[PDB]
Scaffold this motif. Structure first.
Motif, mmCIF file in Angstrom:
data_model
loop_
_atom_site.group_PDB
_atom_site.id
_atom_site.type_symbol
_atom_site.label_atom_id
_atom_site.label_comp_id
_atom_site.label_asym_id
_atom_site.label_seq_id
_atom_site.Cartn_x
_atom_site.Cartn_y
_atom_site.Cartn_z
ATOM 1 N N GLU A 44 -31.839 22.288 -73.083
ATOM 2 C CA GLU A 44 -30.611 21.755 -73.674
ATOM 3 C C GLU A 44 -31.138 20.991 -74.999
ATOM 4 N N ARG A 45 -31.940 20.010 -74.779
ATOM 5 C CA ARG A 45 -32.717 19.401 -75.898
ATOM 6 C C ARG A 45 -33.561 20.500 -76.810
ATOM 7 N N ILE A 46 -34.161 21.254 -76.523
ATOM 8 C CA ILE A 46 -34.838 22.088 -77.213
ATOM 9 C C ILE A 46 -33.853 22.934 -78.058
ATOM 10 N N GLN A 47 -32.707 23.441 -77.370
ATOM 11 C CA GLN A 47 -31.552 24.323 -77.925
ATOM 12 C C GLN A 47 -31.029 23.138 -79.137
ATOM 13 N N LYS A 48 -30.672 22.081 -78.990
ATOM 14 C CA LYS A 48 -29.960 21.289 -79.756
ATOM 15 C C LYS A 48 -30.488 20.835 -81.064
ATOM 16 N N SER A 49 -32.033 20.726 -80.916
ATOM 17 C CA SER A 49 -32.991 20.341 -82.023
ATOM 18 C C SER A 49 -32.776 21.431 -83.010
ATOM 19 N N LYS A 50 -32.806 21.183 -84.320
ATOM 20 C CA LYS A 50 -32.812 22.108 -85.289
ATOM 21 C C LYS A 50 -34.424 22.488 -85.644
ATOM 22 N N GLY A 51 -35.276 21.448 -85.977
ATOM 23 C CA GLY A 51 -36.574 21.858 -86.621
ATOM 24 C C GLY A 51 -37.291 21.922 -85.308
ATOM 25 N N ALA A 98 -40.419 21.344 -85.101
ATOM 26 C CA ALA A 98 -41.170 20.282 -84.696
ATOM 27 C C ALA A 98 -40.660 19.810 -83.325
ATOM 28 N N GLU A 99 -39.474 19.453 -83.222
ATOM 29 C CA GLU A 99 -38.794 18.603 -82.109
ATOM 30 C C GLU A 99 -38.770 19.521 -80.924
ATOM 31 N N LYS A 100 -38.307 20.794 -81.038
ATOM 32 C CA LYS A 100 -38.524 21.981 -79.917
ATOM 33 C C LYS A 100 -40.003 21.736 -79.297
ATOM 34 N N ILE A 101 -40.957 22.035 -80.133
ATOM 35 C CA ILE A 101 -42.298 21.863 -79.911
ATOM 36 C C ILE A 101 -42.470 20.741 -79.097
ATOM 37 N N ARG A 102 -42.423 19.586 -79.710
ATOM 38 C CA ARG A 102 -42.729 18.275 -78.893
ATOM 39 C C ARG A 102 -42.016 18.237 -77.418
ATOM 40 N N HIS A 103 -40.785 18.440 -77.440
ATOM 41 C CA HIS A 103 -39.947 18.544 -76.082
ATOM 42 C C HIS A 103 -40.775 19.457 -75.141
ATOM 43 N N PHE A 104 -41.151 20.637 -75.650
ATOM 44 C CA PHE A 104 -41.895 21.308 -74.585
ATOM 45 C C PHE A 104 -43.269 20.916 -74.334
ATOM 46 N N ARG A 105 -43.808 20.365 -75.267
ATOM 47 C CA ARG A 105 -45.145 19.884 -74.788
ATOM 48 C C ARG A 105 -45.009 18.690 -74.007
ATOM 49 N N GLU A 106 -44.040 17.743 -74.145
ATOM 50 C CA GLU A 106 -44.181 16.747 -73.374
ATOM 51 C C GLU A 106 -43.708 17.221 -71.801
ATOM 52 N N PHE A 107 -42.803 18.037 -71.772
ATOM 53 C CA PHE A 107 -42.460 18.467 -70.418
ATOM 54 C C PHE A 107 -43.789 19.144 -69.703
ATOM 55 N N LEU A 108 -44.440 19.711 -70.396
ATOM 56 C CA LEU A 108 -45.757 20.578 -69.939
ATOM 57 C C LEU A 108 -46.805 19.627 -69.494
ATOM 58 N N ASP A 109 -47.108 18.677 -70.504
ATOM 59 C CA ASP A 109 -47.769 17.457 -70.347
ATOM 60 C C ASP A 109 -47.691 16.796 -68.917
ATOM 61 N N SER A 110 -46.376 16.458 -68.958
ATOM 62 C CA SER A 110 -45.807 15.658 -67.398
ATOM 63 C C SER A 110 -46.207 16.662 -66.445
ATOM 64 N N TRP A 111 -45.916 17.738 -66.462
ATOM 65 C CA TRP A 111 -46.196 18.763 -65.134
ATOM 66 C C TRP A 111 -47.720 18.755 -65.049
ATOM 67 N N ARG A 112 -48.488 18.919 -66.200
ATOM 68 C CA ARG A 112 -49.839 18.996 -65.812
ATOM 69 C C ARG A 112 -50.394 17.622 -65.061
ATOM 70 N N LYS A 113 -49.799 16.527 -65.690
ATOM 71 C CA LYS A 113 -50.331 15.322 -64.967
ATOM 72 C C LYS A 113 -50.148 15.174 -63.621
ATOM 73 N N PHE A 114 -48.708 15.726 -63.343
ATOM 74 C CA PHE A 114 -48.277 15.442 -61.758
ATOM 75 C C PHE A 114 -48.986 16.451 -61.087
ATOM 76 N N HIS A 115 -49.448 17.761 -61.582
ATOM 77 C CA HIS A 115 -50.212 18.583 -60.682
ATOM 78 C C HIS A 115 -51.440 17.991 -60.603
ATOM 79 N N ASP A 116 -52.362 17.299 -61.580
ATOM 80 C CA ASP A 116 -53.602 16.873 -61.320
ATOM 81 C C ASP A 116 -53.586 15.688 -60.337
ATOM 82 N N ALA A 117 -52.385 14.905 -60.159
ATOM 83 C CA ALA A 117 -52.073 13.761 -59.365
ATOM 84 C C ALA A 117 -52.158 14.292 -58.023
ATOM 85 N N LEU A 118 -51.308 15.456 -57.780
ATOM 86 C CA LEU A 118 -50.955 15.938 -56.609
ATOM 87 C C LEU A 118 -52.029 16.614 -55.758
#
Length: 92
Positions: free
Chosen positions: A17-24, A26-46
């Motif tokens: 929803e945040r990706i869709q709402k954002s116009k530029g 840059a914001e969409k890429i930032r949101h996707f990258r943050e989500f993917l980075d959180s997923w990767r960090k959690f995967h490494d921890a687990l």
DNA sequence: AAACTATGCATGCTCTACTGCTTCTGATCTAGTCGACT
């Protein structure tokens, strides 16, 4: 101990929803990258102790890109069938 | 003159059948989706 079992669907929905709402872009890429980075960090921890792991980003990537789904056959429910099911189930 | 028995009536319960009304179920049919072909 798949990562997808610890990630609520609400978080993915909110990110989309945040990706869709954002116009530029840059914001969409930032949101996707943050989500993917959180997923990767959690995967490494687990999976610190496990050696061979088949866990990956597939559970979320398939949902994010439904047009690339080939493991799942056609659901058989188009717009009209979905509307009929919603009307019947909700008792409207 | 008294006791027994033939005759009948009134009523409740039960099997059996028949007619009619209402509701449920088996059977006769169009829309949506996938697929085949050309």
């Amino acid at each position: 101990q798949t990562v997808a079992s610890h990630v609520p669907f609400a978080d993915l929905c909110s990110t989309l929803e945040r990706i869709q709402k954002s116009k530029g872009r840059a914001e969409k890429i930032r949101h996707f990258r943050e989500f993917l980075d959180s997923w990767r960090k959690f995967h490494d921890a687990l999976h610190k102790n496990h050696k061979d792991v088949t866990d990956s980003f597939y559970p979320a990537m398939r949902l994010i890109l439904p047009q690339l789904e080939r493991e799942r056959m056609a659901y058989g429910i188009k717009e009209t069938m979905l509307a009929k099911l919603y009307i019947e189930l909700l008792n409207l």
